[PDB]
Amino acid sequence: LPRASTSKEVDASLLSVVSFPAFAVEDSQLVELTKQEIITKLQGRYGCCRFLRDGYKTPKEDPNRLYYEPAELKLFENIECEWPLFWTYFILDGVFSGNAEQVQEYKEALEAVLIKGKNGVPLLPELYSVPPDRVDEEYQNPHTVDRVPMGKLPHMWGQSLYILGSLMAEGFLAPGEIDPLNRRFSTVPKPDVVVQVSILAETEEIKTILKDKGIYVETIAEVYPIRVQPARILSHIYSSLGCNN
């Protein structure tokens, strides 16, 4: 859980796993730990980055070329552009369970980075790029130089998630309606379970031996309504589900 993969120290995409879509996580202490870590390491000025040392949409790299040469010494350090998707994730994550002040903070943070287009409607830019000239200053003063919008911005994913979050926060719709399966209670502890074990003897000799020491069991006979067989037969039975000719 703490690390996305063996080669990546942290990825921002772990937020989606541990937020509104597909709650699959336990031990909420780890949830708080990963949230604090992503906040303290990937937070920027007008957005957050996916992961350290990505060169996508950079004034270097010769973009018309793929298959990066192994020369990423400093050409992709502290110039990672931005990604407001993980910012608009936070507002939904906060408004989901019980958090309200963080929702207001993130809303006021994201309202500063919006761009108004035709007809005066909200629009979410994809990323903000560092100017090609002011590059040396950022190496000494990270997260200080202003950036410029660049790339496509008909971002339907981010706009849809943001408008869904706004509709959720407006109070028109309840959190229990989006998920009728009730996936919000994955953090509720389960106390314990009681295991039942049955003992049977193969032959009459074994039953006699067990009864000699005071243990009462029954053989495979006398329980004719029920039957026992190995699990390989069960797997061979399972090998016929969903078969179409």
């Binding site: 309840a174 229990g176 309606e177 009730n182």
Partner: protein, 78 residues
């Protein structure tokens, strides 16, 4: 007045299954009262739901409908 062949899907007089038939299926809903009772029933395999999990729906006693019906049919002039 309807003929004997038409009495199939009339309202408040005959059922959809025909006059000389009675095979109605009725629906039941299981709702518990307290968390302790529902977990105790679940320990024996009994499935029941606490009243706090049906938030969009509401369960009210019979006097609410009585007072609502009493509210209706009021005129001031007469």
């Amino acid at each position: 007045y309807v003929p004997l062949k038409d009495q199939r899907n009339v309202s408040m007089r005959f059922s959809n299954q025909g006059p000389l038939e009675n095979d109605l299926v009725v629906h039941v809903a299981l709702i518990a009262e307290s968390q302790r009772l529902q977990v105790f029933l679940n320990t024996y395999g009994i499935q029941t739901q606490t009243p706090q999990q049906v938030e969009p729906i509401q369960i009210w006693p019979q006097q609410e409908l009585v007072k609502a019906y009493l509210q209706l049919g009021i005129n001031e002039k007469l």
